[PDB]
Design a protein around this ligand. Structure first.
Ligand SMILES: [Mg+2]
Ligand SMILES: [Mg+2]
Ligand SMILES: [Mg+2]
Ligand SMILES: [Mg+2]
Ligand SMILES: [Mg+2]
Ligand SMILES: [Mg+2]
Ligand SMILES: [Mg+2]
Ligand SMILES: [Mg+2]
Ligand SMILES: [Mg+2]
Ligand SMILES: [Mg+2]
Ligand SMILES: [Mg+2]
Ligand SMILES: [Mg+2]
Ligand SMILES: [Mg+2]
Ligand SMILES: [Mg+2]
Ligand SMILES: [Mg+2]
Ligand SMILES: [Mg+2]
Ligand SMILES: [Mg+2]
Ligand SMILES: [Mg+2]
Ligand SMILES: [Mg+2]
Ligand SMILES: [Mg+2]
Lengths: 60, 116, 131
RNA sequence: UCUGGGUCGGGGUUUCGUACGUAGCAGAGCAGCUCCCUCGCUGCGAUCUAUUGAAAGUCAGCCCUCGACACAAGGGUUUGU
RNA sequence: CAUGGUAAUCCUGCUCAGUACGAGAGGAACCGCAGGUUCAGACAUUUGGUGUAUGUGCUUGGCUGAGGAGCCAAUGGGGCGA
RNA sequence: CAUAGCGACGUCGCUUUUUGAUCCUUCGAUGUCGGCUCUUCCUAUCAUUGUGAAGCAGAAUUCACCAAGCGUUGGAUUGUU
RNA sequence: CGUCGCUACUACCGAUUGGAUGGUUUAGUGAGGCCCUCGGAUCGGCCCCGCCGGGGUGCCCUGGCGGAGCGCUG
RNA sequence: CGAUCGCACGCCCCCCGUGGCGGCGACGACCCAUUCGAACGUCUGCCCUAUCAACUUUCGAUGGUAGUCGCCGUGCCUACCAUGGUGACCACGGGUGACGGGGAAUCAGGGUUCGAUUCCGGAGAGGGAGCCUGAGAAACGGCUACCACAUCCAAGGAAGGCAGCA
RNA sequence: AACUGCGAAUGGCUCAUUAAAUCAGUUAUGGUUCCUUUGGUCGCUCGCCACUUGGAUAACUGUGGUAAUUCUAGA
């Protein structure tokens, strides 16, 4: 499950290819345009709240 | 731990529970039990059955202003350049606007003097 | 690959199921099931993915008084799918095939059980949807 | 016995599906009051809404209580190389 | 443990292998794998069946002055049901 | 090419799942067809296990041996066997 | 001239509760669209008004962050 | 009840001196007229058939009243009324190997056959049905759904309409 | 390139449907609608931006998803 993380204040969006579903289950069953504290993704994401903004199915 | 599906009643269905119904038209449903299945097969509306999730959120049972804009340097001008330009408040803009007036007056009168 | 697992049968000999292909038949009267050794007094019964011998009871007259192979693609009896889901369909249906497995017709109306799909690839290609 | 096991009660689970009563400028309307009111008020009215995923049952062969209550070192028949 | 009973059976698909063999047409087998049939012994987590828990709604006729609460109709009928 | 597989003319047997022959038991009565159900037994083995032979290249088939452990089904017509 | 016999052809009757194909409909189910009544996942403005703020003079011209007014609207 | 765009570029200066005027257009518009039209109406005219003589009238058939809807007039539809309407001068029904006409063939005169086909009008885009947009479409070299075909797939989906020229 | 405007409802093909229906002549819209062209009209109204007001979206940069399309998402 790739992640197109993007910061509007700086551009510099990048694609991160995670493999731990435990990191992503803080996102699971959250609608779009909702803010999730992404402290479940490693230690590099502390103090970070992120907003879901879409995605694509397995079929694109 | 598989996919959790939802019923006629909207309840969460766990693996090993309930049935799945595949109609000929291609739509497929799943039901938690035979109470939910029979209700669906009798064409009873889930929004009129009190214990249904659809009823409880229709009847509302049991249940801000943000604005930020950030200044960024653009292609053609650095952030230092745009800040100094937009911070000419102490009569620097007055200096530009007064040299503009004298240049406009002297150029317009000179253009009238150019012709004869 | 992997062989087909056991499912609930539901359709004995003498059951009239629908005909989901465009061959011009409206139903198939099951007269026997392929691969049934059988037992005393026990009717040979078939589920989805099973080859049967069937005679169309109504439909085009050129198909009527003949015995055709057929493959059950939908069954109205619930069957367990080795992962807890008990699936059943709105109706019993089948398609007319030859002994080689290819379908006489060219289209299938309605879903097709996954067990029947991966057992008969020629049915799978013509399937509108897989249940 | 470090008590025991009962009987009620409580909680849990679960089954059905939202109780009586009260309230409503909810309600097809209808019948009575019009100095009255400037759009109202007195009754009848299936049904609807809120109280209310409420009410009711749940071991008798469901689970846990240590809450209440009484009761339990008692009875009878036998048995020896 | 003397003694008595005694139980498992058969098939298909994949691979071997379009191989051996054969002029060609055709066309195997052992090892291994995945499953079935008939039989047997159980079991109820799940799906289904039952259902007088006479459990809980719905409902016809009647009956208790009415509401409420119920009851009778040899299980009144019917829905869901531990 | 008699004998892979067959076997005429003849001849020797076995079996009691055919049908006769007889009339020993039963006439102060042994309920007389078939089917359904259910168990067991026989082998003269249809299939399966192990084999031998062929006019057995493969496949399929046929003959024969040890062998009855297991199996031998669903139906239309007919009271039927 | 007719029956009878032979050979071709063409129609007819005929069990088959025969068969096939158009078209018009009763009734049942009913995809989809449109309209109406809702619904409100979201996206904005106003009330900003906790803060440094401020100027005709604590009585803000306001420059941005920020709380959130948990209200009024599109 | 113009917050639009180009073309050459000039006039007035008293109030002065920085502003007011200026020509050619282009784009635009609510409404009127015209043009291209469109739509529904009036009168008259059609092939064979009675082995089609009574049809329409529930579910509108005929008319009235009042509405809804449509661009408008009307049973177009709704409600309440009245029982009407059409037929041997052929209704109604059926068939057509029927798109209609301008026309074509044959020719004393009268007539008889053919007109799918390049002009005019109509209809249709495999069969029906429903619509978005637009002045104009029930459009199909637009969409939506069903039916009949048929396409590619990693079977998770996606995409169609030569009675246009070949 | 993309937004915007226009056109794409014309042409071309075919004759299945269609028997007072279409169509031909004739007549009406005083029962209607009409892009575009052209001609009218655009100071007729008393009523701290006008020296000109606001936000997004394209195109573009950048990250992709999908076996796949004139498929498209986030920033
Ligand atoms: Mg039997
Ligand atoms: Mg209790
Ligand atoms: Mg022993
Ligand atoms: Mg045995
Ligand atoms: Mg009653
Ligand atoms: Mg009562
Ligand atoms: Mg009594
Ligand atoms: Mg009685
Ligand atoms: Mg039941
Ligand atoms: Mg004797
Ligand atoms: Mg006797
Ligand atoms: Mg005797
Ligand atoms: Mg006896
Ligand atoms: Mg022997
Ligand atoms: Mg025609
Ligand atoms: Mg013509
Ligand atoms: Mg034409
Ligand atoms: Mg336009
Ligand atoms: Mg058209
Ligand atoms: Mg169309």
């Amino acid at each position: 499950m790739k992640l197109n993380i993007s910061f509007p204040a700086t551009g510099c969006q990048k694609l991160i290819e995670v493999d731990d579903e435990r990191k992503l289950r803080t996102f699971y069953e959250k609608r779009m345009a909702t803010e999730v504290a992404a402290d479940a993704l490693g230690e590099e994401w502390k103090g970070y709240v992120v907003r879901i903004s879409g995605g694509n199915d397995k079929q694109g | 731990m598989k996919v959790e599906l939802c019923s006629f009643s909207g309840y969460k269905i766990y693996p090993g529970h309930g049935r799945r119904y595949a109609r000929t038209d291609g739509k497929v449903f799943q039901f938690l039990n035979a109470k939910c299945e029979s209700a669906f097969l009798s064409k009873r509306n889930p929004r009129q059955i009190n214990w249904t999730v659809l009823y409880r959120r229709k009847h509302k049972k049991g249940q801000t202003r943000r604005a930020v804009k950030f200044q960024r340097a653009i292609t053609g001008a650095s952030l230092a350049d745009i800040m100094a330009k937009r911070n000419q408040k102490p009569e620097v803009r007055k200096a530009q606007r007064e040299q503009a007036i004298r240049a406009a007056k002297e150029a317009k009168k000179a253009k009238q003097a150019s012709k004869k | 690959s992997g062989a087909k697992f056991r499912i609930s049968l539901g359709l004995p000999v003498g059951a009239v199921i629908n005909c989901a292909d465009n061959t011009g038949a409206k139903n198939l009267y099951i007269i026997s099931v392929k691969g049934i050794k059988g037992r005393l007094n026990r009717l040979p019964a078939a589920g989805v993915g099973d080859m049967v011998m069937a005679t169309v009871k109504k439909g085009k007259p050129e198909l009527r008084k003949k015995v055709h192979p057929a493959v059950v693609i939908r069954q109205r009896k619930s069957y367990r799918r080795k992962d807890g889901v008990f699936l059943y369909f709105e109706d019993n249906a089948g398609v007319i095939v030859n002994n080689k497995g290819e379908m006489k017709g060219s289209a299938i109306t309605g879903p097709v059980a996954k067990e029947c799909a991966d057992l008969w690839p020629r049915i799978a290609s013509n399937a509108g949807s897989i249940a």
